[PDB]
């Protein structure tokens, strides 16, 4: 599914992500836009042979099993495929872990380089939140 800017904002909120660990809702919609273009079916292979999965592009080297990344710790205890379904529940749940765990949202190269320090509130303008 390809979420609407506002529709996703709404959903991430409902899922308790607004201010989770101190990141405004906007920080999340932003990361997701540039990470996956609000498309949950998105995947991308990295050089190291891991693959990125979902709306938030969670990695298989650490967070989830897709059964063809070897070093693989599956800290999320989810098969990667799960992260691609139209309910974002599993992705949030896992994204929460990723972000708690030390580097905050820096863990998302995209967020860091294109989101960090821009007025991210602009992503949730218009929204009935």
From Swiss-Prot:
Record domain C-type lysozyme: where: 1-129
Subcellular location: Secreted
GO BP annotations, alphabetical order: cell wall macromolecule catabolic process; defense response to bacterium; defense response to Gram-negative bacterium; defense response to Gram-positive bacterium; killing of cells of another organism
Primary site of residence: secreted
Cysteine pairs bridged by disulfides in the record: 6-127, 30-115, 64-80, 76-94
Tissues with expression: In the egg white and polymorphonuclear leukocytes.
GO molecular function: beta-N-acetylglucosaminidase activity; identical protein binding; lysozyme activity
Family: Belongs to the glycosyl hydrolase 22 family.
Main function: Lysozymes have primarily a bacteriolytic function; those in tissues and body fluids are associated with the monocyte-macrophage system and enhance the activity of immunoagents. Has bacteriolytic activity against M.luteus.
Protein name: Lysozyme C
Organism, as annotated: Gallus gallus
């Amino acid at each position: 599914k390809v979420f609407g800017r506002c529709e996703l904002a709404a959903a991430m909120k409902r899922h308790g992500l607004d201010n989770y660990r101190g990141y405004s809702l906007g920080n999340w919609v932003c990361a997701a836009k540039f990470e996956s273009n609000f498309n949950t079916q998105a995947t991308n292979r990295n050089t190291d042979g891991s693959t990125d999965y979902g709306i938030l592009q969670i990695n298989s080297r650490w967070w989830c099993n897709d059964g063809r990344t070897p070093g693989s710790r599956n800290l999320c205890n989810i098969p990667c495929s799960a992260l691609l379904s139209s309910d974002i529940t599993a992705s949030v749940n896992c994204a929460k872990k990723i972000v708690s765990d030390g580097n905050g949202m820096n863990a998302w190269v995209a967020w860091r380089n294109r989101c960090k320090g821009t007025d991210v509130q602009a992503w949730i303008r218009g929204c009935r939140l």
